[PDB]
Design a protein around this ligand. Structure first.
Ligand SMILES: [Mg+2]
Ligand SMILES: [Mg+2]
Ligand SMILES: [Mg+2]
Ligand SMILES: [Mg+2]
Ligand SMILES: [Mg+2]
Ligand SMILES: [Mg+2]
Ligand SMILES: [Mg+2]
Ligand SMILES: [Mg+2]
Ligand SMILES: [Mg+2]
Ligand SMILES: [Mg+2]
Ligand SMILES: [Mg+2]
Ligand SMILES: [Mg+2]
Ligand SMILES: [Mg+2]
Ligand SMILES: [Mg+2]
Ligand SMILES: [Mg+2]
Ligand SMILES: [Mg+2]
Ligand SMILES: [Mg+2]
Ligand SMILES: [Mg+2]
Ligand SMILES: [Mg+2]
Ligand SMILES: [Mg+2]
Ligand SMILES: [Mg+2]
Ligand SMILES: [Mg+2]
Ligand SMILES: [Mg+2]
Ligand SMILES: [Mg+2]
Ligand SMILES: [Mg+2]
Ligand SMILES: [Mg+2]
Ligand SMILES: [Mg+2]
Ligand SMILES: [Mg+2]
Ligand SMILES: [Mg+2]
Ligand SMILES: [Mg+2]
Ligand SMILES: [Mg+2]
Ligand SMILES: [Mg+2]
Ligand SMILES: [Mg+2]
Ligand SMILES: [Mg+2]
Ligand SMILES: [Mg+2]
Ligand SMILES: [Mg+2]
Ligand SMILES: [Mg+2]
Ligand SMILES: [Mg+2]
Ligand SMILES: [Mg+2]
Ligand SMILES: [Mg+2]
Ligand SMILES: [Mg+2]
Ligand SMILES: [Mg+2]
Ligand SMILES: [Mg+2]
Ligand SMILES: [Mg+2]
Ligand SMILES: [Mg+2]
Ligand SMILES: [Mg+2]
Ligand SMILES: [Mg+2]
Ligand SMILES: [Mg+2]
Ligand SMILES: [Mg+2]
Ligand SMILES: [Mg+2]
Ligand SMILES: [Mg+2]
Ligand SMILES: [Mg+2]
Ligand SMILES: [Mg+2]
Ligand SMILES: [Mg+2]
Ligand SMILES: [Mg+2]
Ligand SMILES: [Mg+2]
Ligand SMILES: [Mg+2]
Ligand SMILES: [Mg+2]
Ligand SMILES: [Mg+2]
Ligand SMILES: [Mg+2]
Ligand SMILES: [Mg+2]
Ligand SMILES: [Mg+2]
Ligand SMILES: [Mg+2]
Ligand SMILES: [Mg+2]
Ligand SMILES: [Mg+2]
Ligand SMILES: [Mg+2]
Ligand SMILES: [Mg+2]
Ligand SMILES: [Mg+2]
Ligand SMILES: [Mg+2]
Ligand SMILES: [Mg+2]
Ligand SMILES: [Mg+2]
Ligand SMILES: [Mg+2]
Ligand SMILES: [Mg+2]
Ligand SMILES: [Mg+2]
Ligand SMILES: [Mg+2]
Ligand SMILES: [Mg+2]
Ligand SMILES: [Mg+2]
Ligand SMILES: [Mg+2]
Ligand SMILES: [Mg+2]
Ligand SMILES: [Mg+2]
Ligand SMILES: [Mg+2]
Ligand SMILES: [Mg+2]
Ligand SMILES: [Mg+2]
Ligand SMILES: [Mg+2]
Ligand SMILES: [Mg+2]
Ligand SMILES: [Mg+2]
Ligand SMILES: [Mg+2]
Ligand SMILES: [Mg+2]
Ligand SMILES: [Mg+2]
Ligand SMILES: [Mg+2]
Ligand SMILES: [Mg+2]
Ligand SMILES: [Mg+2]
Ligand SMILES: [Mg+2]
Lengths: 68, 88, 275, 100, 114
RNA sequence: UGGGAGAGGGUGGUGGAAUUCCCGGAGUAGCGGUGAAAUGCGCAGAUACCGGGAGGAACGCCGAUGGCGAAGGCAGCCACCUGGUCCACCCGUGACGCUGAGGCGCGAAAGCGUGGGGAGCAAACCGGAUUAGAUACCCGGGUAGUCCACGCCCUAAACGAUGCGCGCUAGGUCUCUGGGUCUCCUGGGGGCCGAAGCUAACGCGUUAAGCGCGCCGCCUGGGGAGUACGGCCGCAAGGC
């Protein structure tokens, strides 16, 4: 179940797109691997950077506690 | 950086004829533009040794063209360096 | 940046001098100087009470403005930066649009031609002065009053500064130049920035003569004296201390604390100095 | 000049008077630093992923501006002096990069 | 007496420590591999953690505790057996979350972790 | 001329996690550590837990068999200043080229000088174990240092143990990054397997260690020895 296939068009540089960016994060808060997002090398780099900016603004989290 | 306008102004001033873009004159002029902006950059950024390698490479490039233009046309050579404040 | 000398005399080998680069004017304001009455270290009884003082260069005292809440809202132009022989900081001459002229101690980064102002509304810029409670936490600051309207007492020497650390009630928490953490009342004025001439501590005096120009007479070790003179006096040949190292007056001088214990300001001191 | 985006997070517990004053400080600074506002989105209060300045929400501003290259760092410094500005982030505006 | 609270499981390779707090995180009681009688490396066994969790759960229930949230930190042996012992004790395990601290590449560790 | 990717470099700012320390609260009989222990810490209230504060260093996931650089080496994020490099167009110059003794610059870590900073870690050091002994390995402490600025030092398994440039000689497969017409084709990188050929073998093989040309550096049995003497460089350590 790859995340990119679950979404139409989105801008990989929109650091404020909280509701799209948040899907690329594991339930524990981490940036998901390319195997689980379905992005190529080139676009995974843009995603990772954008997530990081959004983290600094407080939109996305840096870490979440794992609930069993 | 160096704007697109600034570069064209330099090319116009040294082009040997209307559309000229890669003459030895135009080349020494463009390199001189970069050399002088990197030198000013390195004066403030004295620990930027990696960009300093770019400077040596530029200076060596300009040097080879100048030796070529000196061998082919001494008059054109002297006027180019005087027109640019070079050879000290 | 301190200046060095070639070793063309034995003393010039190590001597270093301030470069005096910030100094833009070489004479004081006539109306802001008065004679500095040399003491030799002697009190009103004529008795030496601080040993080894005297014989330094003649100096004129420059009147420094250690209040500044004096002239809230009136901006002034930084007209000059000058030498002051009575302190390690340099001093800056201010021309108020008032027409009044005063001296402040020159902060690090001050520029002649810039303006400065004092007050609750002053911008947080080098050379401006505000009550502590209006300076943002984290700002490095100098010429701090200790109690409101009593005059700047802290962070006045060359290169020094205090850092605002937090707020509690009417009071602000400062990290003084000594590293001590101290509550200071929020209505106390401070000036933003650090004191200038930060290279002062790198001066190498170089020769005995240079201390003498500063009014520092030779200091003679207790161990060089006789028992009439000093605890360390006496002994045949050299002698170790033979007792806890003491002052001429007998009190121990290696670690013995001397701040008074029941002092009221202890309630306002959070952490004793470090290092 | 170059086009940038000025993200700004403010103390969410102000009143609209204090808030309008902060926006006033910000609007002058932009102007004062040669920044010409082009667009502006104001999403206001918004729950944060983690507490900023110990509060779980923050008041969000956003301006596309055109301003000269050499003054952006200084502008972001001035935008940060106010105790109520919790965050500033001046990103070089870039074209979208799309997937799908 | 409070009936709702928390249970922290600090579980390392050397020991397992259980502290039972109130809703605000203030400890009510605690136990460990040492409190249940062991010393040395025995304190890091699952049975050790078991006795410790039960002795901690028992004491807490003696103050009216009935429901707890469970916070777990560390990757020690008796970690999983400690969760078991809490559930199978009498207390109501309303939740289980792992809050193990992890540096985002922080301080250089001791030689034995390199 | 028009585009691209990138931990390339320099400067200023800035974010969160974690460790330690300090304060407040709550709580008590141990915690810690090991192969097992002891030293250590703890009823003068430790550990574990919650709240607040201070401070330094390093940047989890992304992250890869990945990217960039001439090498050393480069990894949170933002901005500014700046180098190299690739692609398409085939527009300008007209062999302007390759190499390069000396010279000059760069040059991991450790080390040095002056000043700052110091959380964690940790030479030296102290103590506990282990052991026949244990100036070690393991454990509890711990100073330089590790970090910043400026100035020195100039070394290395500084390695691909493989100098640079050009031309030539089957392919197959994975991958990074561009341009097509996007099936695929075509450039530039980075790997793997292999044609011919090379090689003492191992192996190399369009990223040659193949076939050739140019230029530079270097070897000429092991030890003595990278030592001595001289000279040059360095604050010293010590380097050539
Ligand atoms: Mg060049
Ligand atoms: Mg020449
Ligand atoms: Mg100076
Ligand atoms: Mg000298
Ligand atoms: Mg001289
Ligand atoms: Mg000299
Ligand atoms: Mg001498
Ligand atoms: Mg002499
Ligand atoms: Mg001088
Ligand atoms: Mg001066
Ligand atoms: Mg008069
Ligand atoms: Mg007079
Ligand atoms: Mg006087
Ligand atoms: Mg007097
Ligand atoms: Mg008298
Ligand atoms: Mg008398
Ligand atoms: Mg005297
Ligand atoms: Mg002075
Ligand atoms: Mg001085
Ligand atoms: Mg000293
Ligand atoms: Mg001195
Ligand atoms: Mg004097
Ligand atoms: Mg003296
Ligand atoms: Mg003496
Ligand atoms: Mg005598
Ligand atoms: Mg006498
Ligand atoms: Mg006597
Ligand atoms: Mg007597
Ligand atoms: Mg006596
Ligand atoms: Mg004696
Ligand atoms: Mg004696
Ligand atoms: Mg004697
Ligand atoms: Mg004797
Ligand atoms: Mg004697
Ligand atoms: Mg004597
Ligand atoms: Mg003597
Ligand atoms: Mg004696
Ligand atoms: Mg003695
Ligand atoms: Mg004695
Ligand atoms: Mg006394
Ligand atoms: Mg007082
Ligand atoms: Mg702020
Ligand atoms: Mg965009
Ligand atoms: Mg144990
Ligand atoms: Mg171009
Ligand atoms: Mg406490
Ligand atoms: Mg007691
Ligand atoms: Mg805490
Ligand atoms: Mg990894
Ligand atoms: Mg790689
Ligand atoms: Mg490469
Ligand atoms: Mg052509
Ligand atoms: Mg032609
Ligand atoms: Mg060459
Ligand atoms: Mg050479
Ligand atoms: Mg080096
Ligand atoms: Mg080093
Ligand atoms: Mg070192
Ligand atoms: Mg040493
Ligand atoms: Mg030393
Ligand atoms: Mg040092
Ligand atoms: Mg020394
Ligand atoms: Mg030091
Ligand atoms: Mg220390
Ligand atoms: Mg020992
Ligand atoms: Mg022994
Ligand atoms: Mg023995
Ligand atoms: Mg030992
Ligand atoms: Mg150790
Ligand atoms: Mg340690
Ligand atoms: Mg030492
Ligand atoms: Mg030292
Ligand atoms: Mg060399
Ligand atoms: Mg290698
Ligand atoms: Mg290579
Ligand atoms: Mg070699
Ligand atoms: Mg060999
Ligand atoms: Mg060579
Ligand atoms: Mg060869
Ligand atoms: Mg391709
Ligand atoms: Mg494509
Ligand atoms: Mg290839
Ligand atoms: Mg192969
Ligand atoms: Mg074959
Ligand atoms: Mg051959
Ligand atoms: Mg191939
Ligand atoms: Mg071929
Ligand atoms: Mg290659
Ligand atoms: Mg070979
Ligand atoms: Mg031999
Ligand atoms: Mg040698
Ligand atoms: Mg050697
Ligand atoms: Mg020698």
């Amino acid at each position: 179940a790859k995340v990119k296939a679950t979404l139409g068009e989105f801008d990989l540089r929109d650091y404020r797109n909280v509701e799209v960016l948040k899907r690329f994060l594991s339930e524990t808060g981490k940036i998901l691997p390319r195997r689980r997002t379905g992005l190529s090398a080139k676009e995974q780099r843009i995603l990772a950077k954008t997530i990081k900016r959004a983290r600094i603004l407080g939109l996305l989290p840096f870490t979440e506690k794992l609930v069993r | 950086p160096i704007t697109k306008e600034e570069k064209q102004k330099v090319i116009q001033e040294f082009a040997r004829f209307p559309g000229d873009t890669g003459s030895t004159e135009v080349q020494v002029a463009l390199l001189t533009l970069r050399i002088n902006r990197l030198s000013e950059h390195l004066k403030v950024h004295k620990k930027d040794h990696h960009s300093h390698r770019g400077l040596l490479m530029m200076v060596g490039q300009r040097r080879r063209l100048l030796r070529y233009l000196q061998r082919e046309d001494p008059e054109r050579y002297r006027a180019l360096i005087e027109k640019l404040g070079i050879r000290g | 940046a301190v200046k060095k000398f070639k070793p063309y005399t034995p003393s010039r080998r190590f001597m270093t001098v301030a470069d005096f680069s910030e100094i833009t004017k070489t004479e004081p304001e006539k109306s802001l100087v008065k004679p500095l009455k040399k003491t030799g270290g002697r009190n009103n009884q004529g008795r030496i009470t601080v040993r080894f003082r005297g014989g330094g260069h003649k100096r004129l005292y420059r009147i420094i403005d250690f209040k500044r809440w004096d002239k809230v809202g009136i901006p002034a132009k930084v007209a000059a930066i000058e030498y002051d022989p009575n302190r390690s900081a340099r001093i800056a001459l201010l021309h108020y649009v008032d027409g009044e002229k005063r001296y402040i101690i020159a902060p690090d980064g001050l520029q002649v031609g810039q303006q400065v102002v004092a007050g609750p509304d002053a911008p947080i810029q080098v050379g401006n002065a505000l009550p502590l409670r209006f300076i943002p936490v984290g700002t490095v600051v100098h010429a701090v009053e200790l109690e409101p309207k009593k005059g700047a007492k802290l962070a006045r020497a060359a290169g020094t500064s205090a850092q605002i650390q937090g707020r509690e009630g009417d009071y602000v928490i400062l990290r003084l130049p000594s590293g001590e953490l101290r509550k200071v009342h929020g209505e106390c004025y401070a000036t933003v920035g650090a004191v200038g001439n930060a290279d002062h501590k790198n001066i190498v005096l170089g020769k005995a003569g240079r201390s003498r120009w500063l009014g520092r007479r030779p200091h003679v070790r207790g161990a060089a004296m006789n028992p009439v003179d000093h605890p360390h006096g006496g002994g045949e040949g050299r002698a170790p201390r033979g007792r806890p190292p003491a002052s001429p007056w007998g009190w121990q001088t290696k670690g013995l604390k001397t701040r008074k214990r029941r002092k009221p300001s202890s309630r306002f001191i959070i952490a004793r100095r470090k290092k | 000049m170059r086009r940038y985006e000025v993200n700004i997070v403010l103390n969410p517990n102000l009143d609209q008077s204090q808030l309008a004053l902060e926006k006033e400080i910000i609007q002058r600074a932009l102007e004062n630093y040669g920044a010409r506002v082009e667009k502006v989105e104001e999403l206001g209060l918004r729950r944060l992923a983690y507490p900023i300045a110990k509060d779980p929400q923050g008041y969000f501003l956003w301006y596309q501006v055109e301003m000269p290259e050499d003054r952006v760092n200084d502008l972001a410094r001035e935008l940060r002096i106010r105790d109520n500005v919790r965050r500033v982030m001046v990103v070089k505006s870039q074209e979208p990069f799309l997937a799908n | 007496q409070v009936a709702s609270g928390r249970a922290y499981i600090h579980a390392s390779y050397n020991n397992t420590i259980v502290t039972i707090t109130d809703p605000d995180g203030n400890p009510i009681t605690w136990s460990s591999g040492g409190v249940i009688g062991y010393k040395g490396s025995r304190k890091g066994t699952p049975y050790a953690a078991q006795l410790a969790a039960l002795d901690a759960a028992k004491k807490a229930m003696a103050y009216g505790m009935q429901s707890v949230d469970v916070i777990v930190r560390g990757t020690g042996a008796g970690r999983e057996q400690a969760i078991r012992a809490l559930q199978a004790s009498g207390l109501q395990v309303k939740s289980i979350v792992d809050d193990t601290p992890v540096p985002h590449n922080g301080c250089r560790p001791k030689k034995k972790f390199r």
